[PDB]
A paper describes a structure:
The structure of single and tandem SHIRT domains from the streptococcal surface protein Sgo_0707 were determined. We call SasG, Rib, and Sgo_0707 “Periscope Proteins” due to their having variable-length stalk-like regions that define the distance that the N-terminal functional domain projects from the bacterial surface.
The structure reveals two complete domains with a very short (Pro-Ala-Pro) linker; the structure of Sgo_R3-4 is ordered throughout (residues 623 through 789). The similarity of unfolding curves for single and double SHIRT constructs suggests that the two domains in the tandem construct unfold independently. Consistent with the models, the Dmax that was determined using SAXS scales with the number of domains; Sgo_R3-4 exhibits a Dmax of 107 Å and Sgo_R2-8 has a Dmax of 371 Å.
Numbering used by the authors: 623 to 789
Write the structure that this text describes.
Amino acid sequence: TYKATHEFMSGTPGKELPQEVKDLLPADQTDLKDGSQATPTQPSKTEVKTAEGTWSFKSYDKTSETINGADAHFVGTWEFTPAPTYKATHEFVSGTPGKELPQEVKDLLPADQTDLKDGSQATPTQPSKTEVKTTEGTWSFKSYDKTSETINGADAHFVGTWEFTPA
Ligand SMILES: [Cl-]
């Protein structure tokens, strides 16, 4: 007689299995008759959440094997899905009463920042330039309303003020 053993591996490049997944490795099956079919023991659960994301059991490499004069070994793969991420968006406003932003200023609104981790610090993207001259006068960027904000379970939003000086 022979045994059937198990091992787990990550199927997600750059991610090692956490101990909570390794803790689910099945026990060896013992006393298997030579020439019988061995089938791997399924893990007692197929999902493990961590602070980084969720691991989900995919399958073993073989769903059975014939015992042929040696112990059998089954390799089970788990895959990782990162925890939900958030965005940081931007908006521009005029800080000059009675003056609306021209399109040339609005055209400088930064792109959204994506794939920000929960609990991370977001800092707004600075405009590509900070002055725009028009026939009427010049627009200058002042600042965003905050220098940074912690992502705490929601998208962030930064408001940038431009001021106008007439020609
Ligand atoms: Cl993890």
